[PDB]
């Protein structure tokens, strides 16, 4: 999009996220908007680790965005 | 409490459940909030159904409210 990876660094994750939902236009679960966001910071996802409690904050409290209920399900043989 | 039925007729739902929160202090799946609110209000789930959504929304939206996302579990029995 309009950003440079230089930008989105500066940029909290909660605005990169919206960017992320205006051109999904569908529901995406943490985990994978984490791995998204870590992506185009060049990065993988547990090394933003520092930055995941501000991000989820932010998301609680912007009125941007809700927490939808879906369940999520994997694999047992995948732990 | 300090809120009679007539009172809780005349709040948003929302603000009876940060009463019920701080009453309790523990979190709530949103299923069991609005059996309590329901229970307090004298009225059936069934009877609010148009607040809820409004319910859900403001939840979101009013920043003391936490989306938490911690597994809600129950017995397969009670369905
Ligand atoms: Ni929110
Ligand atoms: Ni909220």
Redesign the interface.
């Known amino acids: 999009k309009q950003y440079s990876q230089e930008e989105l660094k500066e940029m909290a994750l909660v605005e990169i996220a919206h960017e992320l939902f205006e051109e999904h236009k569908k529901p995406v679960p943490?985990q994978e908007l984490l791995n998204e966001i870590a992506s185009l910071l060049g990065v993988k996802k547990e090394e933003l680790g520092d930055r995941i409690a501000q991000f989820y904050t932010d998301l609680?409290?912007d009125?941007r965005?809700?927490?939808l209920?879906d369940q999520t399900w994997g694999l047992r043989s995948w732990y």
Chains 1, 2 share one sequence.
């Open positions: 943490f609680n409290i009125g965005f809700l927490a209920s």
